[PDB]
């Protein structure tokens, strides 16, 4: 059935609806950051109506493919942390409740916001317990499974320890130097890099996410070329895709767009803060990591 949350995937939901929604250097955009950091669902107009929108469909608290409300995965949601979330039963029961009686005029934006804005107002605070909305909360959770990657850890850092243990160091750096070494372990180092960067969900690849990533070092040009490689691709696990890119003619704007997102994998607030693309000094971490990695 439906799984709850984590807070990497919770943080990575608050951030990427910021990222789709803020307005772009516009003098508007810090009312919104300093609003929606409070979980002040404020000013009502469009972009907040549909940053509201983005974040319950990304917490999956309103289904998009069924469209309607789903109250059973709140409760879902507070049973797999109840031990460190700080909410009560009866909390999460009068919050169920309400988004249980919620019935939208449609999925808009605007009719959204406008069905589930009092339940927010009312139980902001039971919301932020139970989907990690709290830095404290959300800490609680980290130290209790230090498996979860923290938030100032690289996906990249986090797979090569998951994966690679302290075993096959040598392999290791061979992968970073981004050289199709074929090894079991790279195979499974690509698939839990692929996962987290959101490359692959729910088994498939996400070609959009890709070209996303290109757009990102300033590269949108090339998106046909990178759709075409993916599209074309040979396998279907994250290693095939990964070499067909590695193999490719634009194997070198892929690597500085892996390379960035990399960075950007170690803060998922890294656009929302103001952060601009700088391959000068991505390439200054990847080169000290590429160091201690190997010699």
Not at 158 to 179: A, S
Not at 180 to 193: A, F, H, K, Y
Not at 255 to 278: E, P
Request: charged share 30%; glycine share 6%; hydrophobic share 30%.
């Amino acid at each position: 059935r439906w799984t709850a949350l984590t807070p990497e995937e919770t943080l990575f939901i608050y951030t990427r609806c910021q990222e789709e929604h803020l307005p772009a250097d516009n003098n508007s955009r810090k009312t919104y950051i300093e609003n929606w950091h409070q979980w002040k669902l404020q000013p009502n107009d469009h972009v907040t109506q549909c940053y509201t929108k983005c974040v319950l469909e990304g917490l999956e608290l309103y289904d998009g493919k069924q469209k309607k409300f789903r109250p059973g995965r709140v409760s879902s949601q507070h049973v797999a942390y109840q031990f460190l979330n700080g909410a009560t039963a009866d909390e999460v029961a009068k919050y169920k409740g309400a988004i249980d009686a919620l019935e939208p005029a449609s999925d808009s934006c605007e009719d959204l916001y406008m069905a589930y804005f009092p339940v927010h107002e009312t139980f902001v605070n039971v919301t932020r317990k139970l989907y990690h909305g709290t830095v404290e909360g959300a800490a609680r959770v980290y130290n209790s499974d230090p498996n979860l990657k923290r938030k100032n850890e690289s996906l990249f850092t986090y797979c090569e320890k998951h994966v690679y243990g302290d075993q096959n160091r040598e392999d290791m750096c061979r992968g970073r130097r981004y050289e199709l070494t074929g090894s079991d372990e790279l195979r499974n180092m690509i698939e839990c890099v692929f996962r987290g960067l959101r490359y692959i969900k729910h088994g498939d690849i996400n070609i959009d996410e890709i070209v996303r990533d290109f757009d990102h070092i300033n590269r949108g040009d090339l998106e046909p070329r990178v759709r075409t490689i993916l599209s074309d691709c040979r396998g279907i696990q994250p290693y095939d895709y990964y070499s067909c890119l590695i193999n490719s003619d634009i194997r070198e704007e892929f690597k500085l767009a892996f390379d960035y997102r990399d960075v950007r994998s170690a803060d998922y607030a890294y656009i929302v803060k103001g952060n601009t693309y700088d391959a000068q000094k991505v390439i200054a971490e990847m080169n000290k990591v590429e160091k201690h990695v190997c010699g």
